Ligand binder design. Structure first.
Ligand SMILES: CCN1C(=O)c2ccccc2Sc2cc(NC(=O)Cc3ccc(F)cc3)ccc21
Length: 61
């Protein structure tokens, strides 16, 4: 749980840093990360650690 959480968040951060990912809508990114088993908590953390505007309009909670 703990180790898999750390790894998910870290993978999400590198994901958000990908130049091809960055130019896509926030919605795409959230939905993909959710399909990757991240919690909304972890999604929010990833955006923070990646220094990217946490997408405020959060539909999928
Ligand atoms: C091929 C480039 N790319 C996308 O275009 C893209 C853009 C928005 C949403 C999903 C995708 S699929 C995709 C995935 C990835 N990376 C992974 O699938 C690896 C990964 C990322 C986050 C995780 F939580 C687990 C594995 C990189 C670029 C990329």
């Amino acid at each position: 749980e703990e180790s898999e959480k750390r790894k998910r968040v870290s993978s999400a951060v590198q994901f958000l840093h990908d130049s091809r990912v960055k130019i896509t809508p926030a919605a795409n990114k959230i939905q993909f990360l959710k399909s990757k088993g991240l919690t909304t908590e972890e999604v929010c953390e990833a955006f923070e650690k990646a220094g990217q505007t946490i997408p405020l309009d959060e539909i999928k909670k």
